[PDB]
Design a protein around this ligand. Structure first.
Ligand SMILES: Oc1cccc(O)c1
Ligand SMILES: Oc1cccc(O)c1
Ligand SMILES: Oc1cccc(O)c1
Ligand SMILES: Oc1cccc(O)c1
Ligand SMILES: Oc1cccc(O)c1
Ligand SMILES: Oc1cccc(O)c1
Ligand SMILES: [Zn+2]
Ligand SMILES: [Zn+2]
Lengths: 28, 21, 28, 21, 21, 29, 29, 21, 29, 21, 29, 21
């Protein structure tokens, strides 16, 4: 639902921060 | 997946490291 | 550089929204 | 890459769509 | 309105486009 | 809870991205 | 210009905050 | 407009309130 | 759902904008 | 604290200012 | 320019995620 | 302080953590 959509936005932000130069793949 | 693991309870940044390349 | 870092933050958020169910890779 | 392409001139949603899986 | 429509169900970017000027 | 309020925050960011220089009004009520 | 693009994103966030139930008009011209 | 007023120097929240409905 | 975690993310952004030059303290616990 | 006050209901800007330095 | 203002918004969101339940003090000057 | 350290150059996670309580 909307909660999970909003959560995913925050996940990608966190992954961006933690992964640094490694980068990341995201999939719901 | 990541949504089930990390939207149901808080994932630490260390746990999130698992999803990095 | 800080410029690019802050740009990337916004790029990943945009990719999140554009790619939806498909997901995406970030490299930078 | 995306930073190079996307990070001085604005990339459209269409252009960004190229980076999706 | 938009909140009723899009905070109850996820609106795609295309559907959101429907609320632009 | 404040999920609807926080949904709004995300909604306007998405509107910003989609509308581009079209701009938009946001009228939450 | 990317700097202006990123500025607008932050403007919309601040408008959402300060405007509350009124909402806002984002009209970048 | 907002971009001219507020992207070149920092606008306060009170200044930004001029763009509320 | 991670209600408070996502709430906090928004709270710090709001505090950032409201507080300005004062800065703020975020002490959730 | 702020989480109890402002994650339960929406805090006004004046309420949030209690947490400024 | 507003660069530092925009940077600060990202800084606090990063501090939020890094610090977790510990929280943090943001004192920009 | 933090603005000078972390907005002049990108701070690592470690450098950020220094600022936590
Ligand atoms: O469990 C989560 C969910 C979203 C962002 C985050 O940093 C952690
Ligand atoms: O070119 C860009 C840079 C950042 C976000 C975006 O939507 C486009
Ligand atoms: O339906 C929604 C609500 C919030 C953000 C978004 O991209 C879509
Ligand atoms: O002048 C500005 C520009 C962007 C966000 C903000 O809160 C103020
Ligand atoms: O009560 C709240 C929670 C999050 C953001 C905000 O502006 C107010
Ligand atoms: O130095 C910084 C500034 C902003 C965000 C971040 O993760 C690091
Ligand atoms: Zn959110
Ligand atoms: Zn930004």
């Amino acid at each position: 639902f909307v909660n999970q959509h909003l959560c995913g936005s925050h996940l990608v932000e966190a992954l961006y921060l933690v992964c640094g130069e490694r980068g990341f793949f995201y999939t719901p | 997946g990541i949504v089930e693991q990390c939207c149901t309870s808080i994932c630490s940044l260390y746990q999130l490291e698992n999803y990095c390349n």
